[PDB]
Structure formats: C-alpha cells, structure tokens
Amino acid sequence: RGSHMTPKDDEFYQQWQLKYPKLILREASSVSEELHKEVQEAFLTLHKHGCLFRDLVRIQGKDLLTPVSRILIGNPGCTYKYLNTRLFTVPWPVKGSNITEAEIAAACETFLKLNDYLQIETIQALEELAAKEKDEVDIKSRAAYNVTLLNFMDPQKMPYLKEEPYFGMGKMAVSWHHDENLVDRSAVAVYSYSCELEGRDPDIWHVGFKISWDIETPGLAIPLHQGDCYFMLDDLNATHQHCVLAGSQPRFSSTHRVAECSTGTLDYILQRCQLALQNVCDDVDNDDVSLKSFEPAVLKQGEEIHNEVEFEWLRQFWFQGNYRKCTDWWCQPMAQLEALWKKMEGVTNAVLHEVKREGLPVEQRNEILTAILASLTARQNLRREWHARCQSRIARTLPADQKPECRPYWEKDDASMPLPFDLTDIVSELRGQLLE
Ligand SMILES: O=C(O)/C=C/C(=O)NNC(=O)c1cccnc1
Numbered sequence: 001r002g003s004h005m006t007p008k009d010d011e012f013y014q015q016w017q018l019k020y021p022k023l024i025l026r027e028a029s030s031v032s033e034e035l036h037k038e039v040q041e042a043f044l045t046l047h048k049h050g051c052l053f054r055d056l057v058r059i060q061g062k063d064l065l066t067p068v069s070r071i072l073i074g075n076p077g078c079t080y081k082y083l084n085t086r087l088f089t090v091p092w093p094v095k096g097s098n099i100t101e102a103e104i105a106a107a108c109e110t111f112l113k114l115n116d117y118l119q120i121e122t123i124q125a126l127e128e129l130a131a132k133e134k135d136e137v138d139i140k141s142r143a144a145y146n147v148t149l150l151n152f153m154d155p156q157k158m159p160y161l162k163e164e165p166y167f168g169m170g171k172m173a174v175s176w177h178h179d180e181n182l183v184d185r186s187a188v189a190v191y192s193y194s195c196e197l198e199g200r201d202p203d204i205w206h207v208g209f210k211i212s213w214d215i216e217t218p219g220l221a222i223p224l225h226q227g228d229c230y231f232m233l234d235d236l237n238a239t240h241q242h243c244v245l246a247g248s249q250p251r252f253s254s255t256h257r258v259a260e261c262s263t264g265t266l267d268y269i270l271q272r273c274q275l276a277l278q279n280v281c282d283d284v285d286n287d288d289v290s291l292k293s294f295e296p297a298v299l300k301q302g303e304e305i306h307n308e309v310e311f312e313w314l315r316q317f318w319f320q321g322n323y324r325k326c327t328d329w330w331c332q333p334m335a336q337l338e339a340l341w342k343k344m345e346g347v348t349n350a351v352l353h354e355v356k357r358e359g360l361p362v363e364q365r366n367e368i369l370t371a372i373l374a375s376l377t378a379r380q381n382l383r384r385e386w387h388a389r390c391q392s393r394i395a396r397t398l399p400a401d402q403k404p405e406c407r408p409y410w411e412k413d414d415a416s417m418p419l420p421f422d423l424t425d426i427v428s429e430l431r432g433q434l435l436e
C-alpha cells in the first residue's frame with residue numbers, strides 16, 4: 001500500500017532532499033508582520049466584495065463547476081489559460097499604468113507588492129540552487145511573475161471533497177496536477193493563508209507532492225500554516241505532480257506564475273486582428289467589405305484569425321460574464337475585439353461571394369476552398385460546442401449574476417449580420433464543390 005511522509009516522520013527530511021530538492025518552503029517568519037497584515041485584508045476585502053468565482057471548466061470531456069473560487073490579478077492585458085478557460089487579469093498597478101474600484105484596486109496593488117517580494121526570494125533560491133552547487137538572466141526571467149491566481153475554499157459549506165487515491169493523504173481541495181501554460185522551467189510561488197496521529201493532520205492544510213508516473217515512492221505532505229509560502233523551482237512542476245489537501249477551516253492562496261502569454265495578451269490578439277484586416281480595403285467602416293487579395297495563404301490566415309479572436313477571446317470572455325464586478329478594464333477591449341470580429345464576418349461573407357462569382361476559373365475557386373475549408377469546419381465544431389457548453393444543465397444552475405452569456409449570438413431574423421450563426425449549409429455546399 002502507498003504511504004506518505006510529513007514532518008512527523010524521521011525519513012521526511014531525507015526524502016525531501018533526495019527526491020524533492022527543488023521544492024522550497026518559507027514559513028510565516030520569513031515575511032514581515034506588516035506584509036502579512038495587508039495581504040490578508042487585501043485577501044478579505046476582495047472576498048466580501050465577491051470577486052472570486054467558481055469556474056465552469058472542462059476536464060475529461062465533461063462540464064464541471066470548480067469547488068475552488070478563483071480570480072486572476074496581474075499585468076494589464078494578460079491572460080492565463082486554465083483547463084480550457086481563459087482567465088483575464090484584474091489589473092495591478094504597473095509602471096505607466098492607468099486607473100477600478102478604490103477598495104478593490106488597493107488589494108490589487110497589494111498582491112503586486114506581494115508579487116515583488118516573492119520575486120526576489122525566488123531569485124535567491126534559484127541562485128542558491130545553482131550555487132548548490134557548481135545565465136543570470138534566465139534566472140531573473142523564470143522569476144518574472146506576470147500574474148497571480150487567487151484561490152478560496154471553505155471546506156465546511158462546500159463539504160464535497162474527494163479522497164486522495166495513492167498515499168492515503170486525506171481529503172483534496174485540488175487533485176494531483178501539473179500547473180499548465182507556464183514558461184518552461186519557470187518558478188511558482190504560493191502564499192498560503194489558512195484561517196486559524198497516523199499520518200497527516202486532517203484539520204490542517206497541506207500541499208502534497210508526488211513524482212509523476214510514480215505512486216510507489218512515498219509522497220510528501222507539507223503542512224501550511226497561516227502565512228507559509230512554498231516555491232516550485234525550475235523543472236519541479238514538470239517532474240512532480242502536486243495536490244492540495246484540505247483542512248477544516250477556510251483558506252486562501254495567492255499562486256504567482258509566469259504564464260506563457262505569447263498569444264495571450266491584448267496587444268497580441270489586437271495585432272493579430274490588424275494583420276487580418278490588412279486584406280481589407282479600409283477607406284470607410286461600412287458593410288461593403290471588399291478584399292485586396294484572394295491568394296490562398298492570405299485568406300486562410302484571415303479566417304484562422306477570425307477563429308482565434310472569436311473562440312479564444314470573445315466566447316472565452318462572455319462565458320464568464322458578470323469581471324465588470326471587479327474592474328471594467330476589459331469592457332472596452334472586448335467591445336473593440338467584437339467590432340474587429342464583426343468586420344471579419346464581412347470578410348468571410350466577402351470571400352464566399354467571391355467563390356460563387358461568375359468569371360472565375362474553377363482551379364482558382366477550388367484552390368480558395370482548400371484554403372478556407374478546415375477553418376470554416378473548425379468554426380462549426382467550436383460554435384456548436386461553445387454553446388452546448390453554455391446552456392447545459394449545470395449552466396442553468398444560475399445565480400442571476402453568474403449566467404454564461406453566449407456571445408456573440410444572433411439568428412436568421414437578424415439582417416445586421418451578413419452571415420448565419422450556423423454554417424452547416426455553407427460548409428456542406430463548399431465541400432460538395434470540392435469533390436465535383
Ligand atoms: O493553493 C495552493 O497552494 C496551490 C493550488 C494549485 O496547485 N493550483 N494549480 C491549479 O489549480 C492548476 C490546475 C491545472 C492547470 N494549471 C493550474
């Protein structure tokens with residue numbers, strides 16, 4: 001039978017060193033009573049203002065409400081994808097930053113100060129680890145945290161908790177996982193805020209650790225008290241799995257990460273829209289969208305971007321409507337991207353019109369199809385999906401506030417849209433032409 005180790009065990013110190021050295025822990029002592037205070041009320045103020053939400057994720061081909069309440073503070077315009085769910089940052093004061101709520105923006109700025117501290121301490125440790133022992137900028141980058149994700153769980157009004165399967169560690173707030181979508185070998189710093197035998201103490205919160213693939217090696221259970229911080233360094237998050245073992249009391253955690261956001265920033269997706277729209281004759285913003293090229297490469301590029309802004313951004317955003325609760329930082333940008341998206345509906349319709357046009361040689365028409373077909377296919381599947389997901393039984397479980405908006409959405413009676421929401425008629429017709 002699988003077993004686990006805690007500080008009570010003799011072998012614990014030895015196991016931590018030879019099979020888990022890139023895991024670091026810094027107890028509350030290592031953090032000022034000054035910093036402890038504001039962070040926990042930055043925590044609390046954020047909480048009774050109702051900023052944290054359970055997410056309606058997807059894992060193992062099934063829609064699931066997350067027991068843990070989440071919110072993503074971080075750089076302006078940054079996103080972080082979490083189980084096919086793009087979380088958008090509630091923004092933190094950054095140099096040359098602007099503006100939303102007074103009480104709430106206070107907390108944000110805090111978790112930033114928090115972020116700064118953790119950053120320093122991660123560099124020390126990554127220095128010490130390299131000095132433990134034989135570039136200096138790879139270290140600085142792997143600690144360059146751009147977001148934190150906040151987590152809450154009251155175990156006592158959410159008393160529906162799984163048993164840990166491999167080492168009898170007890171109840172799990174969060175089952176064994178690798179944190180996704182981070183920069184390679186980049187660190188993770190967690191601040192743990194708990195409010196107030198034969199193995200691990202069940203009333204006290206623990207982070208657990210196992211080696212991937214490996215339920216034979218005794219796992220590690222790390223007791224976290226009020227204000228304890230741990231640190232996953234370098235390749236730890238890749239080689240090891242971790243889980244959260246629930247206590248009895250509530251608990252918060254600020255988990256600072258370096259998200260790979262090379263395609264997950266506002267500037268990134270805006271620039272993408274601009275590249276799509278280079279193929280548009282852009283004298284005037286009207287409904288007579290006309291294109292500069294019909295070269296196959298340019299057309300697929302446009303329609304792939306069409307898809308990117310629609311499903312990675314718009315549908316992801318409005319699935320989780322009801323952000324405007326924390327800060328209206330994304331309100332304008334989402335409007336801007338909806339407009340950009342709409343214009344590309346025009347582009348699509350424009351291309352469709354062109355494919356049916358009289359004086360066009362089939363070989364040039366057959367070439368155009370093959371360029372846009374998969375992208376229009378892929379648009380059909382994910383449209384069906386996005387709002388299957390957006391009206392399922394556990395989507396109608398609604399508090400009035402929390403409804404999963406399916407946006408954008410329109411139907412036939414809508415002559416403000418150049419195209420139908422369902423493209424099966426079109427994708428059919430286009431495919432029959434290609435097998436003629
Ligand atoms: O609260 C803590 O100490 C750590 C919680 C934790 O391990 N969070 N990580 C994730 O929720 C997660 C899951 C799947 C992908 N990326 C991140």
Ligand code: NI
Nearest residue numbers: 149150151255
């Ligand atoms: Ni987390």
Ligand code: NI
Nearest residue numbers: 177178179242
């Ligand atoms: Ni994690």
